[PDB]
Amino acid sequence: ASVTALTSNVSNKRSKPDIKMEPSAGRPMDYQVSITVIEARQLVGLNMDPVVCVEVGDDKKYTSMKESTNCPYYNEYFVFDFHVSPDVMFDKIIKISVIHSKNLLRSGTLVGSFKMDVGTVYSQPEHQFHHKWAILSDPDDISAGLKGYVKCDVAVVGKGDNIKTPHKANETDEDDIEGNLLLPEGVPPERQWARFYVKIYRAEGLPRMNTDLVDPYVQVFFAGQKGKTSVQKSSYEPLWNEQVVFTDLFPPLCKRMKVQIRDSDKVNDVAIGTHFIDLRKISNDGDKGFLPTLGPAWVNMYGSTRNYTLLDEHQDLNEGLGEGVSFRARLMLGLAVEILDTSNPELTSSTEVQVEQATPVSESCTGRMEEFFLFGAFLEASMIDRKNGDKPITFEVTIGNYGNEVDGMSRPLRAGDLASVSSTPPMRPQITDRNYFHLPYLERKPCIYIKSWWPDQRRRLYNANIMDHIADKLEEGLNDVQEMIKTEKSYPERRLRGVLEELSCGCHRFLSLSDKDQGRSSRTRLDRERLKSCMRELESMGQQAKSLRAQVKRHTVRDKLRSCQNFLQKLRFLADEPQHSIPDVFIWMMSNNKRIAYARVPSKDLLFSIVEEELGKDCAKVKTLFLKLPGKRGFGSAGWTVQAKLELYLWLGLSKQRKDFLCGLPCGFEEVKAAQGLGLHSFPPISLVYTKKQAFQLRAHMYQARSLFAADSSGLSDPFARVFFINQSQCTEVLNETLCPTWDQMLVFDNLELYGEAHELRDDPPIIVIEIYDQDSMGKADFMGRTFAKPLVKMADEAYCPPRFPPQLEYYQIYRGSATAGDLLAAFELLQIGPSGKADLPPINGPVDMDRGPIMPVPVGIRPVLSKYRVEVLFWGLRDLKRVNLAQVDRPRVDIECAGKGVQSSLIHNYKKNPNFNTLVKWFEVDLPENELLHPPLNIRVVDCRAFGRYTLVGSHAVSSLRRFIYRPPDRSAPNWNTTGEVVVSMDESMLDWWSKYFASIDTMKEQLRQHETAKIDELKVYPKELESEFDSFEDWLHTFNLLRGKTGDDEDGSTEEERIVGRFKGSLCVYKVPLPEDVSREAGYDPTYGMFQGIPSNDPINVLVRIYVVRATDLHPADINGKADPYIAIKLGKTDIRDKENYISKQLNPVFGKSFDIEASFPMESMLTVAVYDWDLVGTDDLIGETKIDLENRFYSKHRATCGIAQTYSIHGYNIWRDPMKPSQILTRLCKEGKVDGPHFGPHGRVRVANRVFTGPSEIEDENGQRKPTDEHVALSALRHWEDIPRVGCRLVPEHVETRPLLNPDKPGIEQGRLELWVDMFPMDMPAPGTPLDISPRKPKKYELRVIVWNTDEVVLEDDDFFTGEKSSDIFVRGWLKGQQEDKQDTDVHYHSLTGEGNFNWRYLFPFDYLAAEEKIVMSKKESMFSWDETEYKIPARLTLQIWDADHFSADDFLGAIELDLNRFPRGAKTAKQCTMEMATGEVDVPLVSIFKQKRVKGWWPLLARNENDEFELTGKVEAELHLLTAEEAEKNPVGLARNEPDPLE
């Protein structure tokens, strides 16, 4: 590829800071874990009744009990719902266990368990595992072996996540367990046991917790286990030297460990601080990796404010559930992993959590204590919330507990006797405006200085600073590439190649810097191993960056960019230091000593170094901080207002390195120092008095906004924008009833004073805060959003000349919290008033409209150049207009306005009889910018026309981008438009049904979704998503515009976007430049009454028969207390509201409906199709599982012909019968007549000519009896299948299909909780009517009867011992069933007192059962319990179970052995009892497998196995059996009796 690259910034993203006002982390979000326990195999137990218990967090659910099987089958679906933050969510433990003998009084005996947290599932490629086997292990015994496997799906979805879900085909497979384990990639299939020594040494700096002492201990949580140390009573500096040892599998699938200091109290046990150790960050896998190690090193814990209160509203911060607002404690800590030798018998095999005495460590192992100096300079404090600032305001800086004056001296003491001044002097605020204050610092900036003592682990922070510097440059470069992609700047591939080259240079630079301290003795094992890992990963990263730079091309910019995103995330993951050294710096606003708002600067960001890459990104720089409310108060409505805005200079480093700690400040200040600092050059000042000052003038060219927040009940706003710069604020004018105001207003901040000649003021200007506000009637203003900007600084010596000046308008992203609230098209420049005064400034011109007066416009050269455009609007109709106020909408009219100009539609004089417009096409002319990116949005605004000029607003939609509707002149010289040149294109049955072709299409789709990851059945096209997702929503000529009314909801609660829809406007737009050329006009026709919209179909009402075929549903959300649902299909279309409550499928979460519903709807009025799934309830209302909206109006009028899908092949009989009443010849004739194509010209019956192309195919049809007639329909359907290749009006037609539409619940938004497979046919009733609906009803199971003649038994173990003489014997009888123990169990008579294991039975079982051949499942209908309302259909595997039992007269019968013959895959029986061995039933592949549905008679010997105390299989008996499968029709013709009875007796 090309080698040319760009290194510098081109796209001006640096003038748009992405300031996060809220922390944007730890926000709660709806999560869902769906777990489908499919089956289990090879479970360890004797006569076990296994129940799978599935826990996610604390909630646990159970499957049904399967009786007397070591390989049960469940196919049961569980859904766990949570509303928690992602860190809490991913720490939840998914535990899949198998228990037995559980009843109402006794907890079940545990067989085996599997542990894996939610975050392991979420880190999967599709956030899920599909068809994987959980390795069960004994969690209480390290010497125990494998306890079985549980095949299961585990999936995690957040709000708005999309998962490719595989379709539920017939799983008639014998897939390998060991090749499909439930483990992440890189984890070995056999996992050893290991011990996690969480050594806890001591803690320092604890706050008050009783009123006033504290009694701390440390509780450690790991993988669901917990253990705690002793309580060190009455100590702020506790000392434990105690290790908490967990025994768990390695490598652990629960990857976070929660260390938590707690205070012991008899009233309530309370948390002090919480730190999470990430095991990913302290370990590496593979042979080159290392075991999880940490320490002995300090760890910093953060939480609530340390002042004592009786009730703490920020107690969740002490639990680690949010960002900490104050320093709580620091804790020496270590972690070690020792892999246990499980074969060695000397150590104990128990797994319970030990608390032992750890070996104490010295303080010198963490690094020698060094004196750190922190300096601050509050250059500016503005934008303080007026709800607090009636009283004087201080700013207190604290690092650790140093400088915490108000909460007490919990500080050890480690210039001479320099007293730390950590708080600014109090000063009364002055009014900026009605919402904000500012402190009048002016020339006197207050300063702070804090002396602290920390261990000298600066090397960790330096390495993190280097790698975070590389990550910062990479993130800035990727934002540059994305922004120049979005604004369509030329050649983004050069910028991406330069970014990759710079990333490779930084990765090479890290390796030369990080090895300069290898000789340090105060260096943990984690430091050495992580340094080696980071060096290896960054060298591999530099090589991968060079390789990816070699692959960047023009068309491949958009897919190498996400490849660089995982580089960015790997640098961010590696850049976090798990061994904390210096705690973060906190800056707090106070008033009357009450803590109000905080900022938290990371300590490594302020650290000083000689090397530029080791230097922190905020060290010796003026940092813009936005203080926020602590805890949950910074979220939502309370966190909307800016609490404060600081320009805070900060420096941190050693006290030996503080010679240049004032170098980053603006020049021209005099240091005012305390009484201790008189005559001392090195003493830091308590304030700066600036003598230099520079006059400035900021111009805010606020031209336009778009897509703004709606803060009025009409769905609109009255937005005006307030611009904040330093200590001043100015407002634009209020524009009424719009969400896209064109203010066109320049705000001039005259004679500003910038104190001090700032270092690099051109490259780092002060930030501008822009706040939108909805003006209201009696005087308040709703917060409408906030964006940030950086002005283009023009110095006095600079010329106001291109290419830098005048600044162009750019879009600044507006936010309300975290939600996007539109864009602000504005430009900002910061012009210095020179020595000559204001004459050097560019001229300020008067307004074009003289009535505006003192309001200045955006000047020429900054405002966009306008050109004439014509917007042509098609007014197709208005659908589903909801009630405005209480009344109905009766005379609607559509006013469409763009950039002040506009047109109004014809008034619909009566909405009910015909919601249509008399004039279909109207147009207006409007000046729009040359740049298509700067085009203002077009507003659709439907009003209800009452009498006497009184209009009420029904709804409003904002078309944000007009570029979809922009008519460029099409290229008709392309070879696709060529219509000349001849092109030639060439081409046990009676048991098939629609399910045959459906399963064939499902298999074809399943292999087609695996192709890109690297007799014959005619098929259809199964879509994994909606049909709209394939055919671009059928919006080829007709578009939908959802009208909205009411206020937009908040980011957490309130209204939602789908609730605010009060109607739909049907129509299209076509925007083109004026004048349009005449040849372009005649290429598009341009009839004067239709404009650009040629080929528009008839607007008249037409009756349409809508036939909805509902096939099945998958993964339905449970809506009953038993974890299941009783789904039925409820379809709403127009006035027809079918609710099929009589045909519900009871207790099924994957129902097979097989239904068809006929609804006659008057199109285009009755066109919103709502197919819903409802859980039927015996008492109370039926619950909505989910629903989908299909919008048949787009389907009916589309050029894709979405009315009826066209089949792959044509026939008039059988499973592939042609559904459409219009034959393929008629469809081809209609498509040629509508498209004005010459044709279809049928010559001989095997060919047709459509335009320049000739199709050929078979020429004869089959009329159901083997006889043939000549026909034209095969070649017509071949032409219809290749209709996309037609040159002039060719189009990909909709095939016969089954679409998978997600089911959405408004009560549980954002999470898909169902997948309804369906398809919709539409037939106009003025055409000939279709026939009967297709029989897509589910397959009736074929009736069978399996006859199992148990002849004899041999070598049965003798269970009984004689009480008087002592010889062994056994009362052998055989127990057999096919469906279950409570439904098909039959026992032979007892062969009493067998002294050798030989039994003689000659006993015939009969097992009548219903069978589905495709699913290989026995179908049976039975009640779930005795107290149940209805019979439930169950599908179980066809498995014959034969068991040997010993009959006891005075006790229960004793289980001896069993075999579970799968009737499709059971081994062949041996010819004699001698040839029967252990290897037939176990995992040896050398024994061939036989299906009884093919062989139809198998006689032989089979082994019966039982597990002893050593958990191994042993041969406890052999049985001779004669399986003989018959149909029911064969069984009635040849009847036999039970046991030995007539007919066909047995001896």
Ligand SMILES: CCCCCC(=O)OC[C@H](COP(=O)(O)OC[C@H](N)C(=O)O)OC(=O)CCCCC
């Ligand atoms: C007394 C026995 C209580 C047993 C526990 C209990 O509360 O059962 C509620 C039952 C079942 O209702 P659902 O299946 O919708 O609740 C399940 C829910 N949708 C979910 O999915 O969580 O309803 C009634 O008894 C009728 C109430 C209204 C009567 C007018």
Ligand SMILES: CCCCCC(=O)OC[C@H](COP(=O)(O)OC[C@H](N)C(=O)O)OC(=O)CCCCC
């Ligand atoms: C012979 C007695 C029959 C009694 C039949 C009866 O009353 O059934 C109602 C329910 C059981 O109904 P389903 O679980 O099938 O719920 C149906 C569907 N899933 C729903 O959601 O509603 O009974 C109980 O809860 C305990 C009753 C104890 C009565 C002593």
Ligand SMILES: [Ca+2]
């Ligand atoms: Ca206490």
Ligand SMILES: [Ca+2]
């Ligand atoms: Ca309002």
Ligand SMILES: [Ca+2]
């Ligand atoms: Ca308002």
Ligand SMILES: [Ca+2]
């Ligand atoms: Ca229910």
Ligand SMILES: [Ca+2]
């Ligand atoms: Ca129900």
Ligand SMILES: [Ca+2]
């Ligand atoms: Ca209900």
Ligand SMILES: [Ca+2]
């Ligand atoms: Ca016995």
Ligand SMILES: [Ca+2]
């Ligand atoms: Ca006995």
Ligand SMILES: [Ca+2]
């Ligand atoms: Ca017994």
